[PDB]
Ligand binder design. Structure first.
Ligand SMILES: N[C@@H]1C[C@H]2CC[C@@H](C1)N2c1cnc2c(-c3cccc(Cl)c3Cl)c[nH]c2c1
Length: 502
């Protein structure tokens, strides 16, 4: 599904792969592994190889001479069904993904790991059908598939080790088919499980979970990941984004095209915020580029983009309808001279109408990292509909990368949390600006994780990539970069430490 991404290939290796194993229309994507959030799309055309840069500074994937995308999988899906051009404007066709054989980004691949370590991990964390593949230590170059089976409710469970031989670049389990990569082998024995002579089915149901940690042991995990293990954990997460190609048909409708900041960054249909009670004289009045984010799908969120001038009225309709009482903005109005979050609220002490909605800005309060605006929102003609909406505008996030210290983000989220908790029956917290996926995804995930710790204490389990994958199933590409990924771990660590300091 995403075998076209090669995490460990060089540019020359990419050319040699396309020229020797590809044809015209063959393509792959790869990182620039030194430089953060640089990728290359390498494409064979007329017997030569073109390299197209994709940049991600934290907000979206920006394909040079193309469009902006929420994930590389959504990028590849878009051009494999459509549009891509060179500097000189010639069409570059993405026809044939050139598949990677490298197992390092697979959830089940542990690399160097002994049989006793694999048994201990499968014993402590595994259940029936949990498996992993590890390098062989007795027969170098070969591999071992280790699988737990049993009763998950004293000998009722066991671990089986199946030897995987590598013989001339192909892989086998001692007989039958010979596979071009470990992934093909694992996929085959996932669909067609091995059976032991005496009948046990070696069911490959789920990879062994290695990312769930006790929150108390965050500092140790961050230490191991900083030896660089954050990269591999992040790329293993990125590999699974091909499971999240959910439909975005509503956002693609002609009537909704100009309601999106970027034409291809769109809300999933199954989680989009549907706007009711619109003008009956607008044919399509139900659409905003926003998704409900419900953790492990009390506190929920709406993740959305910065307004366009023609969606400000819809944004207020959304806040009103959903009963939201707290807004987080993740960008300044302008960064690098470019509009990142258009002003949609009145000046301090002023009152404005935004279609059927009326907003008063009661008071602004400046703090070091943010500005708070106390807004009163009501429906025109209906005085008794008024409610206070507290807008927390984060203003110190750097123009590129992530904050060097998570303290400001954490203090801000602590205040936002208490505000939300103080208001009976407050609806979801709105988090937005830019495309509403990078910084927005980062703030939401931190907030989710820190809320578990706040209620359960240091002695509770957290799983950073599993949480992110759960949020990415509700809006495309929530958490854009490895720098934001590492920043989430750092924020959880700093939160745990400040709570041990008190
Ligand atoms: N290649 C390896 C990278 C390290 C080291 C061993 C193992 C595999 N390990 C790992 C395992 N699992 C994940 C996940 C993940 C966890 C829950 C749900 C989903 Cl969908 C995902 Cl992708 C993200 N990163 C991981 C890294």
């Amino acid at each position: 599904s995403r075998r076209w991404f090669h995490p460990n290939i060089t540019g020359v290796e990419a050319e040699n792969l396309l020229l020797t194993r590809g044809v015209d229309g063959s393509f792959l994507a790869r990182p620039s592994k030194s430089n953060p959030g640089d990728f290359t799309l390498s494409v064979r055309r007329n017997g030569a190889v073109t390299h197209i840069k994709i940049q991600n500074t934290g907000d979206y994937y920006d394909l040079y001479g193309g469009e902006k995308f929420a994930t590389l999988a959504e990028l590849v899906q878009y051009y494999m069904e459509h549009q891509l051009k060179e500097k000189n404007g010639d069409v570059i066709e993405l026809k044939y993904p050139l598949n990677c054989a490298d197992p390092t980004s697979e959830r089940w691949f542990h690399g160097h790991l002994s049989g006793k370590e694999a048994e201990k991990l499968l014993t402590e964390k595994g259940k029936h059908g949990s498996f992993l593949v590890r390098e062989s230590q007795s027969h170098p170059g070969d591999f071992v598939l280790s699988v737990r089976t049993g009763d998950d409710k004293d000998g009722k469970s066991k671990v089986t080790h199946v030897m995987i031989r590598c013989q001339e670049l192909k892989y086998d389990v001692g007989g039958g088919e010979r596979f071009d990569s470990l992934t093909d082998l694992v996929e085959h024995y996932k669909k067609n499980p091995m059976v032991e002579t005496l009948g046990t089915v070696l069911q490959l149901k789920q990879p062994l979970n290695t990312t769930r940690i006790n929150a108390a042991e965050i500092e140790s995990r961050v230490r191991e990941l900083s030896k660089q293990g954050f990269w591999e954990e992040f790329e293993t997460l990125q590999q699974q984004e091909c499971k999240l190609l959910y439909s975005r048909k509503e956002g693609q409708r002609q009537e909704n095209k100009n309601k999106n900041r970027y034409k291809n960054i769109l809300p999933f249909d199954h989680t989009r915020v549907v706007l009711h009670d619109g003008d009956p004289n607008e044919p399509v009045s139900d659409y905003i580029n926003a998704n409900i984010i419900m953790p492990e799908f009390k506190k929920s969120y709406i993740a959305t983009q910065g307004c366009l001038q023609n969606t400000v009225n819809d944004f207020w309709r959304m806040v009103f309808q959903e009963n939201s009482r707290v807004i987080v903005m993740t960008t300044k109005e302008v960064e690098r001279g470019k509009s990142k979050c258009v002003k949609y609220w009145p000046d301090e002490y002023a009152l404005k109408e935004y279609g059927v909605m009326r907003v008063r800005n009661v008071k602004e309060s400046a703090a070091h990292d943010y500005t708070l605006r106390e807004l009163k929102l009501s429906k025109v003609g209906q005085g008794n509909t008024e409610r206070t909406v507290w807008q927390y505008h984060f203003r110190t996030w750097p123009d590129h990368g992530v904050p060097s210290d998570p303290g400001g983000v954490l203090d801000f989220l602590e205040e936002v949390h208490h505000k939300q908790e103080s208001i009976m029956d407050a609806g979801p917290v709105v988090v937005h600006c830019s495309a509403g996926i990078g910084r927005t995804g980062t703030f939401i995930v931190i907030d989710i994780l820190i809320d578990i710790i706040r209620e359960k204490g240091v002695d509770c389990d957290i799983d950073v990539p599993k949480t992110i994958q759960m949020v990415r199933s509700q809006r495309s590409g929530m958490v854009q970069t490895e720098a934001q990924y590492r920043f989430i771990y750092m924020a959880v660590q700093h939160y745990i430490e400040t709570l041990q300091r008190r």
